[PDB]
Each structure stands twice: as C-alpha cells, then as structure tokens.
Amino acid sequence: LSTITTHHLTVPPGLTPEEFQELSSSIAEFHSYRINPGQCSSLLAQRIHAPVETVWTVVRRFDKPQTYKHFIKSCSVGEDFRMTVGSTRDVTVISGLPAATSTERLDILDDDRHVTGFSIIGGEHRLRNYRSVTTVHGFERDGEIWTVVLESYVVDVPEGNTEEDTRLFADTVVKLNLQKLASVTETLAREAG
Amino acid sequence: LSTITTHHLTVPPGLTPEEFQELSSSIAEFHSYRINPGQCSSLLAQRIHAPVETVWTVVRRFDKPQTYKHFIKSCSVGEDFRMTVGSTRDVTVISGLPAATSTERLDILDDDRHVTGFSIIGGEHRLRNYRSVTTVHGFERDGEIWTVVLESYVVDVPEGNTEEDTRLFADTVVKLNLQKLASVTETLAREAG
Ligand SMILES: O=C(O)/C=C/c1ccc(O)cc1
Ligand SMILES: O=C(O)/C=C/c1ccc(O)cc1
Numbered sequence: 001l002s003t004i005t006t007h008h009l010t011v012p013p014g015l016t017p018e019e020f021q022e023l024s025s026s027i028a029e030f031h032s033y034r035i036n037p038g039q040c041s042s043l044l045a046q047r048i049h050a051p052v053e054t055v056w057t058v059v060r061r062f063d064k065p066q067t068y069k070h071f072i073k074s075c076s077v078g079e080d081f082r083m084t085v086g087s088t089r090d091v092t093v094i095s096g097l098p099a100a101t102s103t104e105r106l107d108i109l110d111d112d113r114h115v116t117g118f119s120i121i122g123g124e125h126r127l128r129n130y131r132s133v134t135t136v137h138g139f140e141r142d143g144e145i146w147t148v149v150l151e152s153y154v155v156d157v158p159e160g161n162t163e164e165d166t167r168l169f170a171d172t173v174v175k176l177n178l179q180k181l182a183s184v185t186e187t188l189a190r191e192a193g
Numbered sequence: 194l195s196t197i198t199t200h201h202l203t204v205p206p207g208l209t210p211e212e213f214q215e216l217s218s219s220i221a222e223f224h225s226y227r228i229n230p231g232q233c234s235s236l237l238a239q240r241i242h243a244p245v246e247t248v249w250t251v252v253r254r255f256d257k258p259q260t261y262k263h264f265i266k267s268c269s270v271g272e273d274f275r276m277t278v279g280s281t282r283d284v285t286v287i288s289g290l291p292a293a294t295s296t297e298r299l300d301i302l303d304d305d306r307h308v309t310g311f312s313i314i315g316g317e318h319r320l321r322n323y324r325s326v327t328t329v330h331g332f333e334r335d336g337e338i339w340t341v342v343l344e345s346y347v348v349d350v351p352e353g354n355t356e357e358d359t360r361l362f363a364d365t366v367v368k369l370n371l372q373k374l375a376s377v378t379e380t381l382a383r384e385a386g
Contacts, residue, residue, distance in 0.1 A: 071365060096319035096362035098353050126289035160291050169289035172264060176369070 005033045007043035007152055014178075015045040019148055023137055030115055030133050031152040039129075040167045043152040046178035050189035052138040055147045056114050058185055059134055062106050063089060068181040071095070071173070085109055093125055100125050108133065126169065128156040147185075149178060198226045200236035200345055207371075208238040212341055216330055223308055223326050224345040232322075233360045236345040239371035243382035245331040248340045249307050251378055252327055255299050256282060261374040264288070264366070278302055286318055293318050301326065319362065321349040340378075342371060 008027035011020045020027075033041050048055055058067055063081060066072040073092040081087060084106070091102040102123035109116050117133035132153035139146050151174055157166045201220035204213045213220075226234050241248055251260055256274060259265040266285040274280060277299070284295040295316035302309050310326035325346035332339050344367055350359045 070369065073361060094361050094365050096354075096359055097351075098355075098358060158290075161289075162291075165291060166289055168266060168287050172287050176263065 002034050002036050005031075005035055005041045005043075005152075005154075007031050007041070012043045012045045012150070014047065014175075015148065015150075019045075019047075019139065022139070023148065023150065026135060026137065027150065030117075030135050031150060033131075033152070033154045035154060038157050039154055040157055040163045040170075041152065041154040042167055042171050042174075043150060044171065044174045044178060046149045046151075046175075046182055048147040048149060048182045048185055050147055050185045051145055052114060052136055052147050054189050055149060055181070055185045056111075056136050058181060058188070059114075059136055059149065060109065060111065060116055062087065062109070062116070062118070065089070065091065068184050069177045070180060083109065088121075091123075093123070095125060102127075107131070126158070126166075128158065130155045130170075132174075149181060151178060195227050195229050198224075198228055198234045198236075198345075198347075200224050200234070205236045205238045205343070207240065207368075208341065208343075212238075212240075212332065215332070216341065216343065219328060219330065220343065223310075223328050224343060226324075226345070226347045228347060231350050232347055233350055233356045233363075234345065234347040235360055235364050235367075236343060237364065237367045237371060239342045239344075239368075239375055241340040241342060241375045241378055243340055243378045244338055245307060245329055245340050247382050248342060248374070248378045249304075249329050251374060251381070252307075252329055252342065253302065253304065253309055255280065255302070255309070255311070258282070258284065261377050262370045263373060276302065281314075284316075286316070288318060295320075300324070319351070319359075321351065323348045323363075325367075342374060344371060 008024055011017055031043050035041050061067055063077045066075055071094040073094050076090045087106045089104050091104055093100050093102055100123060103121050105119045105121050107117040107119055114136040120127055120130040130153060134151045137148045155170055157163050201217055204210055224236050228234050254260055256270045259268055264287040266287050269283045280299045282297050284297055286293050286295055293316060296314050298312045298314050300310040300312055307329040313320055313323040327344045330341045348363055350356050
C-alpha cells in the first residue's frame with residue numbers, strides 16, 4: 001500500500017555526510033512524503049558559494065521561475081498577483097511538442113525558515129501531479145560561508161513507464177535547474193551591490 | 194520550395210562580431226544547409242577558455258557523447274567499433290517516456306580541421322531526421338588563447354508543431370550541451386597532465 005519516503009535516512013547526491021547530519025531534521029520535516037504505487041519521489045542537493053539570503057531572493061520568486069529554471073518559454077501571473085500561498089502561475093514549457101501550459105500553485109512560502117513549494121495542478125506534460133519543496137540552508141567553517149539547497153518532489157509514473165523512466169528524467173531536470181541557481185546566485189554574490 | 198540557410202550571414206548567439214568575421218567562411222562551408230518546408234535549422238556558438246586540441250579530444254569521442262551531453266542514459270557501440278565515418282551508436286535517451294533508443298551515424302570526422310557531424314537515423318523522439326555538424330576553432334589575443342565551438346543542425350518540425358515549438362527546444366538542448374562541454378574541457382585544461 002502506501003509508504004513513507006526515506007530521503008531523510010541517506011546522504012542525497014551532492015551533499016556531504018557532515019552537511020547531512022545538520023539537515024537530517026529538516027529533510028524529515030519538509031522533504032518527507034507518503035507515496036503510493038505508481039508514484040516516485042527523489043531528493044536533490046546543491047552546494048552554492050553564496051549567502052543564504054542571496055540564494056533565497058531567487059528561490060522565493062514564484063512569479064519568475066525562469067530566473068533559474070531551464071525549458072521555460074514564458075511565465076504569467078496576471079494583474080493583481082501578490083506573493084501569497086494559494087497563488088498560481090501559468091508556465092509555458094519548452095517541450096518540442098505543441099504549446100503546453102503548466103498551471104502551478106504556490107503551496108508554501110516561509111521567509112523566516114526559507115522554505116517554499118509548489119504543485120502542478122494542470123498541464124499535459126510528463127510531470128502529472130508533480131509536487132515539490134525547496135529549502136535553503138546556511139553553513140559556516142572558519143569564517144567561510146556557503147549554502148545548501150535541497151529540492152525534493154513526488155510525481156506520477158505514467159502508465160507504460162517504469163519508475164526509472166520517470167525518476168531519471170525528473171532528477172536530470174531538477175539537477176540542471178539547481179546548477180543554474182548556483183551559477184545565477186554565485187554571480188549575484190560576486191557582484192554584491 | 195527549398196531555401197539555403199543563412200547562418201553564415203549573421204552573428205549567432207554567443208559569438209562576438211570579431212569572432213564571426215574570422216569564422217564566416219567556415220560557417221558557409223560546414224554550417225550551411227538546404228532546407229524545405231517542414232524543417233528548421235539553427236547555429237549555436239560557445240566560447241571555451243581551453244586550447245583547441247583539448248576541446249577536440251572531447252568533441253571527437255563519438256562513442257561517448259555522454260561526456261558532454263545531457264539526457265543520455267547510456268550509449269553503446271558494440272564489439273569491433275572503430276572511429277570511422279559510417280559507424281553507428283545506440284543512444285538511450287532520458288525522455289520521461291518509455292525506453293527510446295536513438296540510432297545515430299557518424300557522418301564526418303576530420304582530425305586536421307576539427308569537424309565532426311552525425312545523423313539520427315532511427316528513434317521515436319522529438320528530433321526526427323536530425324542532422325548536425327560541430328566545428329572547433331582557435332583564437333589568440335596578446336598571448337591569451339581561447340576556443341569557439343560552432344554547432345548547427347537541421348531537423349523535422351512534427352505535424353502539429355510550429356517551427357518555434359521545435360527550434361526553441363532543439364536550441365535549448367544544444368546550448369545546454371555546449372555549456373557542459375565548456376565546463377568539462379575548461380576543467381581538463383586547468384588540470385593539464
Ligand atoms: O517536459 C515536460 O514534460 C515538462 C516540463 C516542465 C518544465 C517546467 C515546468 O514548470 C513544468 C513542466
Ligand atoms: O527528448 C527527445 O525527444 C530526444 C532527445 C535526444 C537526446 C540525445 C540524443 O542523442 C537524441 C535525442
């Protein structure tokens with residue numbers, strides 16, 4: 001029947017064991033899912049050489065996912081958009097197939113603890129019933145500072161797919177976007193203001 | 194009816210006008226196509242801070258495209274593979290759909306002038322009748338050296354797609370792979386041997 005994900009019990013790719021020991025409680029709190037047959041879930045991590053609030057300024061921009069995500073043609077949120085849970089955005093995906101809008105809802109926004117998350121509620125692409133959470137975490141060693149971003153998701157495995165058909169694809173895209181986030185925010189850090 | 198591509202008459206993205214003036218003849222020679230209704234073609238460029246032969250060692254590895262390309266699960270070339278024109282590779286794509294092999298044929302391999310190219314001859318994905326050429330070029334200024342890689346393609350626009358539905362997708366993937374090529378070969382350069 002249903003199971004609970006175990007992302008909080010092993011070191012995810014891109015994280016060191018030292019860093020995992022610090023984040024184990026956070027992974028249990030925000031990156032645990034109850035999962036059924038026909039779904040898959042994964043946790044991805046990315047180290048960034050920038051301060052936490054620099055990274056968070058980009059991660060929290062629900063109306064501009066294209067700032068750090070690939071394969072987005074445009075993103076629209078209409079007239080009276082405010083950054084509040086329950087809001088939606090219309091993402092036009094670069095798919096190589098006809099025009100496809102992904103309607104996505106903001107599920108979480110915590111500026112104090114640096115957690116956000118969203119749900120794909122409509123759209124004919126390869127990520128049905130997709131739901132994901134992103135959290136941002138600061139680290140220090142001998143005066144040096146860095147950030148770790150954790151991003152997890154749950155998603156449907158389409159009939160005819162193997163779980164790995166879907167997990168490898170979703171992992172590749174999330175990982176590519178985190179690499180872009182790292183590049184964009186490290187550049188922001190190097191240039192300051 | 195048919196037309197000739199004009200990649201050699203404008204500065205492609207990622208190239209400076211100075212660099213274009215040097216490559217104009219090469220773009221005409223290796224990156225020109227005759228194109229019909231229902232096809233699209235593009236030219237992409239990527240600057241790399243590494244010597245030409247360092248970049249070429251990776252670009253020419255027809256049996257290991259995953260060294261610099263994303264979304265490749267595996268690549269197989271069988272028992273008696275030799276790096277000669279006419280050889281084929283079986284690429285398993287990360288698509289988020291069921292298992293899909295891309296059979297690809299090596300069309301060009303010129304180690305003196307640093308040109309290669311391949312054709313997708315079979316495979317149920319979004320790049321039907323795909324054909325591409327990659328060329329590598331060295332630059333110098335006041336003792337500093339760099340490389341420019343040019344990569345162009347022609348591909349079918351599926352029925353039901355607009356040309357931009359296909360061109361934006363193909364451009365995004367080629368551009369992402371060139372960014373990976375840059376990272377991989379700049380790392381190789383920094384570490385020498
Ligand atoms: O390629 C697909 O099937 C879906 C891609 C996708 C990319 C960005 C999104 O916000 C949603 C879906
Ligand atoms: O996503 C697709 O439809 C096709 C992808 C692709 C990626 C690498 C290849 O070598 C061929 C096709």
